[PDB]
Amino acid sequence: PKIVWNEGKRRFETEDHEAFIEYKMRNNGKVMDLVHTYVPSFKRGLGLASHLCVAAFEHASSHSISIIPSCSYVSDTFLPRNPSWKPLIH
Ligand SMILES: CC(C)(COP(=O)(O)OP(=O)(O)OC[C@H]1O[C@@H](n2cnc3c(N)ncnc32)[C@H](O)[C@@H]1OP(=O)(O)O)[C@@H](O)C(=O)NCCC(=O)NCCS
């Protein structure tokens, strides 16, 4: 699954632009707020949103940025299933 970083749309997304996680940067680029995840119906229940989240966390982590998990997929599903990411959380 090729996920890319589209800075201009503030998202990490599949190459076809169809599935994405959108963020807003806060505190002068120090905090990435994950605000909305969307996977289209035909591609759901297969782990795609999880891979989108991993792309965003790895990005935040390599750049020394912390995360706000505003999006309910992130706080309610991804983090509980992946607690080793919780130190990234603002
Ligand atoms: C939420 C969404 C991105 C998940 O995509 P996905 O690729 O199907 O997600 P994954 O396969 O990684 O994980 C599926 C898990 O998502 C969880 N989930 C589904 N909807 C959720 C929601 N709105 N909030 C918290 N988690 C949700 C379920 O627990 C599901 O677990 P299961 O394996 O027991 O069915 C996708 O269903 C979607 O685009 N929904 C509409 C937009 C939305 O409500 N986004 C959340 C707020 S930003």
Curated annotation (Swiss-Prot):
Active site: C71
Entry superkingdom: Eukaryota
Primary location class: other
Residues in N-acetyltransferase domain copies: 2-90
EC number: 2.3.1.-
Cellular localisation: Peroxisome
Keyword annotations of the record: Acetylation, Acyltransferase, Peroxisome, Transferase
Binding site for CoA: H36, T37, Y38, V39, G45, L46, G47, L48, A49, S50, S72, Y73, T77, R81
One term under GO cellular component: peroxisome
Physiological role: Possesses in vitro histone acetyltransferase activity with histones H3 and H4.
Identification of the protein by name: Acetyltransferase At1g77540
Organism of provenance: Arabidopsis thaliana
